[PDB]
Amino acid sequence: DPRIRSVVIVGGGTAGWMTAAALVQHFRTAPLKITVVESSVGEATIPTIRRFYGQLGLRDDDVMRATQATCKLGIRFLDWSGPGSDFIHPFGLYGQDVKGIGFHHYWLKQRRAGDAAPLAAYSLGAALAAGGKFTLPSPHPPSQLSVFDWALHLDAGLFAQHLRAYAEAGGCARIDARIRSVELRPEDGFVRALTLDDGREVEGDLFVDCSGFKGLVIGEALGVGFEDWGRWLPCDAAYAVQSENRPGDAPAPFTRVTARSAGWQWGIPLRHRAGNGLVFSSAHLSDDQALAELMPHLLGDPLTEPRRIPFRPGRRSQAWAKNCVAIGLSSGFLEPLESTSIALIETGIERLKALFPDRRFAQPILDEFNDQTAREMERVRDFIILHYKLNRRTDTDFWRDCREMPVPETLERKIALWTARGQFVRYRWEMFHPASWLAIYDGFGLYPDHHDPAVDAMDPAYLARSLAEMRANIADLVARTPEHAQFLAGL
Amino acid sequence: DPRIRSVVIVGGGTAGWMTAAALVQHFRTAPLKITVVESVGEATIPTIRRFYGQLGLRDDDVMRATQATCKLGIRFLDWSGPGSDFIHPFGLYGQDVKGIGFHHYWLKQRRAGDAAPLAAYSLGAALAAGGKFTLPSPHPPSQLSVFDWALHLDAGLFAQHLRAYAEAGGCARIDARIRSVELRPEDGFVRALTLDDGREVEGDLFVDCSGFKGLVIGEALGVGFEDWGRWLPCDAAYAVQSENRPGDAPAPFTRVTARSAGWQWGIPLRHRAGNGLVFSSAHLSDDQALAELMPHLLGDPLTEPRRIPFRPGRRSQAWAKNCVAIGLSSGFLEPLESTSIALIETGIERLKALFPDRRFAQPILDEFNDQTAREMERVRDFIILHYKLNRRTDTDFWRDCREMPVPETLERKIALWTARGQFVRYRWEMFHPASWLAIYDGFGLYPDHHDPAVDAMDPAYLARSLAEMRANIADLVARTPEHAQFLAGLDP
């Protein structure tokens, strides 16, 4: 029977144990052996992660308790447009669409006629994040204005441990062991087995490489190459360090992303601790200069000294080769500017299930998986690039260069249709939907010349009052919502 | 103010008056002049009910005015050999489970000996086969009760209804032949139309609804044509209206019957029907064509058949300078899957979403041109598939269709379907995965292996869940009124 009989996941962490837990649930009562092989820090996410553990039978409160987690309503971008600049990228839409026309067009008309209200006054998500508030969104919500979503700041290590215990209870084997070698079949070149340090062999029909950046099976064993993207993205290094919260420091329901002289700093709040880091260009900063930016501005008392991490932006040339599928860092890397690492694991897993193979490993299945994965990486790359491309900082060469650097043609087309007409070019496999593009356009102050002319038919007095009603509903709803701290105290 | 001040629509019919009515509603109280300049049974997809929906019109009023009947899908007869019979509905099949598509569970059971057609799990299809009709529920218990519906209608009457709508909102109308198109000297943009009497009709924005010749997009502006006869064999058609015989209840579906070298259509109106044969002249003479068509009409012919040249393909760019082409002026695909009116609708929605100013910014044209091109290609490929998968042995026409090369975009779809039972998704598909499924199943092409999470389920448990679904539909159909009752509530 051509049926896959066994799955061997090479590496634990988030990638390995998310994969194990997801495959355990999906194939719970089927005759499928699943085994992980591994040896004996704060992170952000997007809302997809709540659905991921949702599908496993897990609750938000239980996962949050176990992972030292806090709520994430969006990301806060500080100083990207010059000293004091400040906007929030939320999970939600702005305002209410009318007659099929997007809200932002009516907002632009009114902005043209003198009104100075920020686009963010019409997003409940963003207003809640700025107010240090949190509440669960209503399902079957009164109207479009009250729709927002939310995600987690969490300990990735704890998250990995929680999913491990979940996977093992459903019958996933675990082998604590270093791997000496990967053995290939000499007719096919397919992966036959892993050889452990003690000489045991671990055979499998399907291998998932979660070994990390090195790529032990997809790269070293099978020779799959790497598409380097350093040419598009300047930054090439990072420092990270956990901090301990100081007494009377209420963690905020957002991630802080603060632009510095030659890169940017992150701030990921957990319940009693926080993730901190600086991403930067070594060609503009020494190691001591980097620490001089990072260390005086942490969200708390450092727990250790900073570790350096090499960044190498890009993607594995094919994420699936023969009978190896690469999930997580083994399949590529983009900096955490928009919290996408775990998200790329989630999409990889959903795709593996949607295209799960048999032992013939039919070439069209690999081709489709490889094609989706490639386009999706490129669509996230382009969103990340945009942030640098539209900066308005005058203070260093790093930032001028980012503003004048060439960018992929796919992003040129997006930027060009936005400034010409206020519309969105839509490709396949976008992680980020139109409202997220809008948040970045508006955050960097780039607006179209021409809004949609059906909008100029509306009366400026009538419009002005519909908008003030929206603006007020949000402000007053925010005002009466409890603080983030109260939801955390109930965990 | 760079604002468009005026719009001139060149040609009436469906393309011209759908455009006028849509732009009248969308720009109702704006200072925008709109003018049209001008001098048979058809099918649609459900988008058309939304189109006139957005205008403030009701299904019953439009149906009364257009001699219309209900359309639940299309019925394909004899494409797989004598007696073959399947329906492409507007709906999904069965109930998806645990994120896995219904068709995988159906395939597992089919593997184990059960012979129930995939169509037994579509309410839409079951209602069409049963000669039944009912409005779908607005807030339905589950996926099993969800279907949509469209119209068979008189296109001429539909054009007249929209004309009266457009004129009441302030659209000018000029009855006149056009002598020439005048181009402006710096830009080469269209300045004005010159009429037979010498009047000029000026505009900032021109819409070419002139038909196949392409008076502005083609003749005036020189935009070329991508011919697609290489991919699609048929190159001609005959159409003829028929009068219903007494005691002939029109069916709630379109009939598409394969013949020796092409196919016949049958579009029922309330007291009349559209009929035609699409075919390859390289395999059939004109008299051979009429010998297939004329003995098998849905009634007494109202005239003699007119021939129509078919030339499948698309205008190279649908928008050039300040001319947007809508309808036949932008391209042509045969009505195998009822897409003509649908392509006008998508063109109009796109024009509104990308409505320009007088600078005619190049990125707007480029996006419009790109969307339009891809969408035409996605409809072409769906049409091609129908010929590619035929199982007819009786003529050379049909062997060739089965062995003909097909675009790479379609090769990839067919390859992932047979390998894994999954759908390659491109941008701008008019037809969603369930429609592809209907064609794969109708021509008997199924994957080698279904999704293996499905084999976790017990064959006895599965067999009974499926028989319950199969029965819920059959019993819902059984108690639903006939098509005729809904039509009597529009009529005498």
Side-chain angles (χ1 to χ4, degrees), chain A residues 121-418:
Chain A
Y122 305 91
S123 170
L124 170 55
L128 285 167
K133 304 320 182 53
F134 183 84
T135 191
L136 299 185
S138 292
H140 336 298
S143 63
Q144 137 101 124
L145 210 69
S146 41
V147 186
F148 61 105
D149 207 358
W150 66 286
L152 312 185
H153 304 114
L154 49 39
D155 191 312
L158 297 180
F159 190 48
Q161 293 171 49
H162 193 85
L163 302 170
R164 169 176 168 191
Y166 181 97
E168 279 178 0
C172 176
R174 175 172 178 280
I175 293 172
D176 191 346
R178 291 187 207 162
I179 299 153
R180 191 175 299 276
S181 287
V182 184
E183 319 309 327
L184 308 178
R185 260 142 57 177
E187 56 276 49
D188 282 19
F190 276 42
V191 178
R192 190 179 57 80
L194 306 184
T195 292
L196 309 186
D197 261 344
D198 70 25
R200 281 182 288 154
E201 284 193 346
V202 186
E203 294 175 37
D205 295 343
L206 176 70
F207 288 80
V208 192
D209 185 342
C210 306
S211 68
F213 203 48
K214 66 185 200 201
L216 197 56
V217 191
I218 196 69
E220 288 179 35
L222 292 177
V224 173
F226 200 78
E227 315 294 311
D228 235 274
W229 285 343
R231 76 153 153 286
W232 304 120
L233 293 153
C235 298
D236 70 329
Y239 275 113
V241 61
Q242 292 288 103
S243 68
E244 184 72 71
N245 286 5
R246 315 176 230 254
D249 272 346
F254 54 79
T255 302
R256 274 190 181 76
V257 176
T258 301
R260 306 293 283 141
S261 79
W264 58 272
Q265 172 183 349
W266 83 75
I268 294 184
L270 306 184
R271 271 206 302 291
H272 306 296
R273 289 181 181 190
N276 310 253
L278 194 91
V279 173
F280 65 95
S281 174
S282 67
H284 299 72
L285 279 180
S286 62
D287 284 3
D288 302 327
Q289 286 165 352
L291 301 178
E293 302 200 306
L294 184 266
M295 297 301 306
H297 295 119
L298 304 177
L299 287 164
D301 292 304
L303 290 177
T304 61
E305 294 220 312
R307 296 189 273 118
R308 220 209 201 223
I309 315 162
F311 266 24
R312 184 195 188 183
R315 76 181 180 75
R316 185 66 54 196
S317 297
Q318 295 79 42
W320 187 340
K322 291 155 192 306
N323 66 330
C324 184
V325 184
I327 301 288
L329 287 187
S330 65
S331 68
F333 177 77
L334 293 168
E335 66 201 83
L337 180 63
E338 286 273 1
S339 307
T340 54
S341 270
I342 287 175
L344 291 155
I345 290 153
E346 298 174 66
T347 55
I349 288 153
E350 174 51 67
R351 190 176 288 120
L352 176 49
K353 296 192 279 174
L355 300 166
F356 204 83
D358 71 22
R359 290 167 54 191
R360 303 193 312 288
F361 283 89
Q363 192 55 55
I365 296 171
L366 278 62
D367 288 351
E368 183 63 11
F369 187 107
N370 286 331
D371 190 66
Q372 294 183 18
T373 306
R375 307 296 76 81
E376 165 178 275
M377 286 291 292
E378 290 166 356
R379 304 287 74 76
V380 178
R381 181 203 58 190
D382 291 2
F383 190 58
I384 291 163
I385 286 167
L386 185 65
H387 291 69
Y388 291 109
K389 181 55 161 173
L390 305 180
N391 91 82
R392 291 201 183 198
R393 283 179 67 99
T394 89
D395 63 84
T396 55
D397 281 9
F398 175 78
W399 290 114
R400 291 175 195 90
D401 289 354
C402 280
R403 188 167 40 250
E404 290 150 31
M405 84 201 309
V407 308
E409 153 164 45
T410 43
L411 183 57
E412 280 174 3
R413 284 175 56 197
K414 274 178 140 81
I415 294 175
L417 186 72
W418 170 253

Side-chain angles (χ1 to χ4, degrees), chain A residues 1-3 26-27 29-31 99-101 350 352-358 360 362 364-365 367-368 371-372 413 416-417 420-421 423-429 449-454 456-458, chain B residues 3 25-30 98-100 108 349 351-357 359 361 363-364 366-367 370-371 412 415-416 419-420 422-428 448-453 455-457:
Chain A
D1 195 38
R3 209 181 292 292
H26 188 72
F27 291 113
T29 68
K99 295 185 165 184
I101 295 159
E350 174 51 67
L352 176 49
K353 296 192 279 174
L355 300 166
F356 204 83
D358 71 22
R360 303 193 312 288
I365 296 171
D367 288 351
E368 183 63 11
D371 190 66
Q372 294 183 18
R413 284 175 56 197
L417 186 72
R421 187 51 186 72
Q423 284 283 16
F424 302 98
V425 176
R426 290 197 214 199
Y427 302 114
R428 309 168 291 151
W429 307 113
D449 347 309
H450 166 253
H451 59 257
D452 186 325
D456 297 312
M458 199 155 140
Chain B
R3 205 187 289 293
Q25 175 85 315
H26 190 236
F27 291 111
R28 197 168 276 285
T29 68
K98 295 176 176 167
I100 296 159
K108 170 172 185 55
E349 179 39 68
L351 175 50
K352 294 192 287 171
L354 302 166
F355 205 83
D357 72 19
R359 302 193 308 289
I364 296 176
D366 288 352
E367 184 62 14
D370 191 65
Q371 294 184 17
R412 284 175 56 195
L416 187 68
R420 188 48 186 74
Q422 283 279 28
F423 301 98
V424 174
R425 286 181 216 207
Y426 302 114
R427 309 167 292 148
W428 307 113
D448 348 306
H449 217 267
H450 61 256
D451 187 325
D455 295 313
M457 199 147 135

Side-chain angles (χ1 to χ4, degrees), chain B residues 146-190:
Chain B
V146 185
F147 62 105
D148 210 356
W149 67 284
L151 313 183
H152 303 115
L153 50 37
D154 189 312
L157 297 181
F158 190 50
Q160 290 189 23
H161 194 85
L162 301 170
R163 169 176 167 188
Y165 181 97
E167 277 175 355
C171 178
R173 177 175 176 277
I174 294 173
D175 192 343
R177 294 187 200 197
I178 297 155
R179 188 197 297 149
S180 66
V181 187
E182 320 307 329
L183 311 172
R184 106 189 169 207
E186 174 77 296
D187 282 9
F189 275 42
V190 177

Side-chain angles (χ1 to χ4, degrees), chain B residues 50-78:
Chain B
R50 182 187 74 234
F51 172 87
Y52 63 74
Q54 271 155 230
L55 307 181
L57 306 183
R58 297 163 51 87
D59 294 306
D60 56 22
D61 296 326
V62 175
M63 289 181 78
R64 263 186 292 270
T66 57
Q67 290 298 118
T69 67
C70 306
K71 179 178 169 201
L72 286 171
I74 303 173
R75 192 167 186 164
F76 290 93
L77 299 171
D78 307 333

